[PDB]
Write an enzyme that holds these catalytic residues in place. Structure first.
Site: not given
Ligand SMILES: NC(=O)c1ccc[n+]([C@@H]2O[C@H](COP(=O)([O-])OP(=O)(O)OC[C@H]3O[C@@H](n4cnc5c(N)ncnc54)[C@H](OP(=O)(O)O)[C@@H]3O)[C@@H](O)[C@H]2O)c1
Ligand SMILES: O=C(O)Cn1ccc(=O)n(Cc2ccc(Cl)c([N+](=O)[O-])c2)c1=O
Length: 316
Positions: A11-12, A15-16, A18, A44, A78
């Site tokens: 499957a495909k 790459i970007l 949410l 995600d 997950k």
């Molecule tokens: N597998 C795992 O163990 C694991 C662990 C961590 C994360 N993840 C996944 O990865 C995703 C992303 O990582 P993350 O949620 O840790 O953090 P991130 O995507 O690195 O950062 C999210 C933060 O950046 C802000 N932001 C987003 N776009 C922005 C922009 N254009 N300008 C300024 N600020 C911006 C968001 O604010 P607002 O939302 O307030 O706009 C939020 O506070 C998670 O949501 C989850 O789906 C998985």
């Protein structure tokens, strides 16, 4: 820059995608609806994020509105740590499916290699402040995941936060039925993951970069911690390209043949973050961003460091 990457199930995967961790139930339906509108197809998710129901509402809305069809979406969830026992895995997957309101998942990951005590609490702690583990192991949990593919609940299975030795354990498992399709790991300019990425890609395992903006909204952050989004060296690269720092931080892993899943709940930022297909970081930008590595990870808990399967004692 093709928008999807081939997985080892045939499957495909876009790459970007949410990210949805910390997007609250009352706001995430709007977020996911906007995301689908502006072009996101990969979302995600996770049971532990406790917002899958509301993600699912957005998907149902966009199906009903004739904005997308199911097969165009790539929905990832997950298995949480408290459901690693073989006998609990199917039910956990089914709960996620019921909440997302889907027939199948495109990809289902073992969220962390560490099994936690089964029960209602997601992070059961003892009097020492350490997580209470379960009597589960990576290989048996993997076998249970494999059954989900054979039963048609999920199209692909993978792992998250596995170090290279943990990946190897699965790859060398006697009677292995499916290789992991994906390893989803923290990755950004302060934690560039060169060795683990080299390792996984060589095995035909696609790497997804989580926390690509440095997770500034994480709860356990330390005043004495970094801030990628405010790094002027990264803003300088953005300014050169007339883009924002977030856009640079998203484009960076894309040019490393990674999938990336930036989180926002804000419509304006969700839209901004997808506008990364109209520019390219130069080969010098790429080398420069890699040079910012400081081996600094933000997603790790002291309360998990005594778990037999804690992934971050190893170099990679
Ligand atoms: N597998 C795992 O163990 C694991 C662990 C961590 C994360 N993840 C996944 O990865 C995703 C992303 O990582 P993350 O949620 O840790 O953090 P991130 O995507 O690195 O950062 C999210 C933060 O950046 C802000 N932001 C987003 N776009 C922005 C922009 N254009 N300008 C300024 N600020 C911006 C968001 O604010 P607002 O939302 O307030 O706009 C939020 O506070 C998670 O949501 C989850 O789906 C998985
Ligand atoms: O798991 C996610 O996707 C996001 N998230 C949520 C809570 C949390 O404690 N953590 C940190 C965490 C969770 C489980 C574990 Cl098992 C570890 N760890 O360090 O071993 C860390 C998160 O990364």
């Amino acid at each position: 820059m093709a928008s999807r990457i081939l997985l080892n199930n045939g499957a495909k995967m876009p790459i970007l995608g949410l990210g949805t961790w910390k997007s609250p139930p009352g706001q995430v339906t709007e977020a996911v609806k906007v995301a689908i509108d502006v072009g996101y197809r990969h979302i995600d998710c996770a049971h532990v994020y406790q917002n899958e129901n509301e993600v699912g509402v957005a998907i149902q809305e966009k199906l009903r509105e004739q904005v997308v069809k199911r097969e165009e979406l790539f929905i990832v969830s997950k298995l949480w740590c408290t459901y690693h026992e073989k006998g609990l895995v199917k039910g956990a997957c089914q709960k996620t499916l019921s909440d997302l309101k889907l027939d199948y998942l495109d990809l289902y990951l073992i969220h962390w290699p560490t099994g936690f005590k089964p029960g209602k609490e997601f992070f059961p702690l003892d009097e020492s402040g350490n997580v209470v583990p379960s009597d589960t192991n990576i290989l048996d949990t993997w076998a249970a995941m494999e059954e989900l593919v054979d039963e048609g609940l999920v199209k692909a299975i993978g792992i998250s936060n596995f170090n290279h030795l943990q990946v190897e354990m699965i790859l060398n498992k006697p009677g292995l039925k499916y290789k992991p399709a994906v390893n989803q790991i923290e990755c950004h300019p302060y934690l560039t993951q060169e060795k683990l990425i080299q390792y996984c890609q060589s095995k035909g395992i696609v790497v997804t970069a989580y926390s690509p903006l440095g997770s500034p909204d994480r709860p356990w952050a330390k005043p004495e911690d970094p801030s990628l989004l405010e790094d002027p060296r990264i803003k300088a690269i953005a300014a050169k390209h007339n883009k924002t720092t977030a856009q640079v931080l998203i484009r960076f892993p894309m040019q490393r043949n990674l999938v990336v899943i930036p989180k926002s709940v804000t419509p304006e930022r969700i839209a901004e973050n997808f506008k990364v297909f109209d520019f390219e970081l130069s080969s010098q930008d790429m080398t420069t961003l890699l040079s910012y590595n400081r081996n600094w990870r933000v997603c790790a808990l002291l309360s998990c460091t005594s778990h037999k399967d804690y992934p971050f004692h190893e170099e990679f």
